[PDB]
């Protein structure tokens, strides 16, 4: 019916406690979504090629060349933390929970309203927004995951984080195979390195259309859409971090001489001279046993070539790393490779009253200490003569390839069978919740963008579009673009996301770190006098846990 | 759908007579509520600080500083006597009832109509109103009392008292925590006293969003919303007043000399010398047995510091009292602290035709004689020598702290274990019907604003809003306010309020006082020739009852 | 009149003159409706004679108070009557290695705001003529009995039928857990030593 | 103690629910709070007075 | 006891270890212990 | 121990254990003793002590 509502607006978060301390967390989100008719009803194939910027020697890192298919369809994506949880809910989760399971996801579009903008011929421009009771909204759900996976959180394009403010869906586009070469260079290179776009390999051409893969439902002003509950099969996520490095695994050394008075200068001492000590070492040609040479069960974390760019058919890309740096927690100036940096706009955390195209940015310095401090590493010769001489030790200060700015840690890789590491912590509010597992034969151990990864499937993408509203002049043989009545739509979107969490327990005498409103951050969680709102980022793994 | 009505208007009051002289009073109210879209769809944290008025020494009582959160939601509050009863029904109640019980309360919204205002660019200004058959009203019922309680009667912002006059809802706002210091001063105080708005304590921040705490129903023109019946549990309210002060409790003295002739000065005598009498007194060192010294079972009413302002974190506030003034019943000019003053506008009793912003005011001089007359009080020394000499008696005429205008009664409190006092009488038509018990470990014995106080809970506040109506130009990434189609709603609210009352009995030979129309007040209950209407105030505890 | 730009320099305005406002007040002889004079349902907290000692057969004892002070949350030095102060030894929290008879002490500043700020109180005459003149207002700056250090608030009790207050908050670690109700015919409403 | 409050019907002593202190050792200090009973021959006074 | 619920948009005050109070909750080198006072009623509730 | 129950109710069991050291009493007799700090209170203005 034209005058009957087809849904209800719910944005409450429900905590249902269960036996054994398990809590069923149902996050309800409701948004008003505004959708304009597309610029063109045609599927375009468009190639970005910023040869101008990458032509300047030394700017290869700024490559943006890529071929993509631009579709008339838009994507309603809710795969971000802020779409579901407000700061209070996130506090109640992180401060009290220990591990989190992703259970179910369902979404529905209701209260579809369609309007036409009749512009008047009056000399001062004006327009009247009439209803079009017979207009239709096209909705497609890719339950089979036929289409390429395009998570919006990577571009900061998910639904808004504020229930009251309306939100827009992102236009949908997907990569299209291309070949690209870009020989790297530096300020001071002679000539022009090869920077050419080779086109497309026919063996890889894949042109996807919604109209040919997904059943498209037509919703008039009185119709409604529901996906049905989807169920996840992902691994649990830890809301706790590990502090122990290789130096803190196992039984410490017995102190034959304990301190006798308070104060820092009163240390303890192991007593036994180092070369007379006892223990097991993986160093078969030295009698020295120290906390740096003693055998440990395995290796926590790994070193990787940092800011290393690898080139393939499609050009260069940064080599991803799994863990952040070390020492950055004490000095944010040291934040580097491995610490995800998030840039977002006014729908996703930036103060709504601010002006300018500049996004709000922050680097997430994870709490876990599974990182590395490359400046502290060193290699030395197998003879292991001490103190090591200049010739027999490779230090981070030593140049590789004659370069004063590149040292051996930049090309170093110590990933091995003994490497133990942790999944990426959730990022609030701009972090992605779940991600689809690669369809490769052999699959990665973790994804750097989402704590939850999808083994079988995770919910199909929801595409929205406004049905073409023809005028009376439409001639399909005409070369010009279709003449359409200017139409737009607003529809309410309701999503239910179900997690299952375990409540934490007190294992230690001391208290643990907890998120808390304080005088410094007080205003980050309330509106301004002119309605300004913002969501600052919150850490997700405050509580510690013992790695071993 | 569009053309079928969803409810029926009803404003009749039904009296159904049960057994044992109990009457079931069902008051139906129905209103045509008019609502506009909010000034904005963003919650505002607005601080008001009338430093200019309080900066003048001696104007500390005029402090209006406060921090509040303004919301895009409007409150449909029907918690006032005038909304349910007209003067005739109230006359029947007061004249023929002795006690009143509040039983149930239900309400519903129906015949929702939404319209858009297309203002034409025509050179002569004009505007045309069109039915928008797809827009929605947002209705939220806080059935769990999650949001702050905000009784509108305190600001005279309840629905109108006239069934045939459309009413408006009140925009909703709720206090945000703040700290405020205001050192009092007087005309002649040197310098500027400390008067500063300190900000907000992080430990007390509470930002409530209806979207997050309540489920919101979207009502199109063909939809209806009904709360369902809630049931009260409050204590009963007495429609009889108590006149016996301590002086009239118990057995009067025996008169051995009755008057032998009728007259206004032919008094009787007790005939026994005062120190030779018999009885009991709480004076252990006086043989005088007098009506002013004889032991009474307890104390009726209590003395409180009148016009006392106490300061806390949020600033000064008057100390409330539960009883009125003495002597004001004979001379209204003496009406003072304790006698509630109600100021109201044309929707709530003031002549609907009177011009100007000045509201109509009245002070409710209660009939209960539980108040005190501080000019008749006095303290005197423990010795109790009579006639009392100056050095041994403290009088209301005697200054405290050197101030000639402040006497001991201003700081005199006599509330104690023996105190007995009555509940506040209903104030028609502007009085509040029910109130929420405070969430404190120790709860107040009564409330000064309402006769009925809700032990556990009582009906959730009903919030209404006009759903956003976007244009095609909306862009959430912009900082400006949302572009909207000018839209408003008219909807019919219907409520049913159920009381139980007991019928009074004629215990005494003489008749009692009743509310009656007379030549003086005749024209207050009928409309004027130009349609004007007013609702003057009527007392509620006419009949007397024996306190002891 | 809501504001139009951010910052603490921009406040809001009620916009209606104080004497032309609508509302309910307990001041039957004045037309002003202000946040300090509007009717509130009841009274939260109560003023009590602070540092008052009462004597009985066994001698003087301080009158206990069921609420803390105000302003102590911002300035701890103002922590005063009504905020319990605990002194304890090395068995019960003091550093186990300190040498000396001095116990470790702390004043528990409660988070609740049920207390009072006596320096902000004032009484004034029933007439209520504003701005109030010297003879018509009693202030904490005014003395009682000629004492320059005692003001009326020191001897002021505003406990009444409308008073609403909370129970004492638990104090960790030194706070008492439970207590025995007095064997009196009329029992106290709360105890100040155990929740 | 020995406080008189006035209302519609005139003045009256404020009653107190507790007695005095030190009166147990000195009857001369018996004061506000200690009830005084005055009665005749039917109720305790020597019937031959 | 009863577990609390999130009633507001903002987070509430919570007890937490920090660099200022870090060493109050652990022993010293010679075994020095202490237990410092901690507040109880951290969360706010609306009185009315 | 924290054992979680229906509808958010949680059952807390605090176990405490101590080695208590007790000496024999100074005397086996119930003494009646009066403390009288007249010396400190004799200084006018020290009544609170």
Automatic annotation (TrEMBL), chain F:
It comes from Canine parvovirus 2b. Belongs to the parvoviridae capsid protein family. This is Capsid protein. It is found in: Virion. It comes from the Viruses. The gene is VP2.
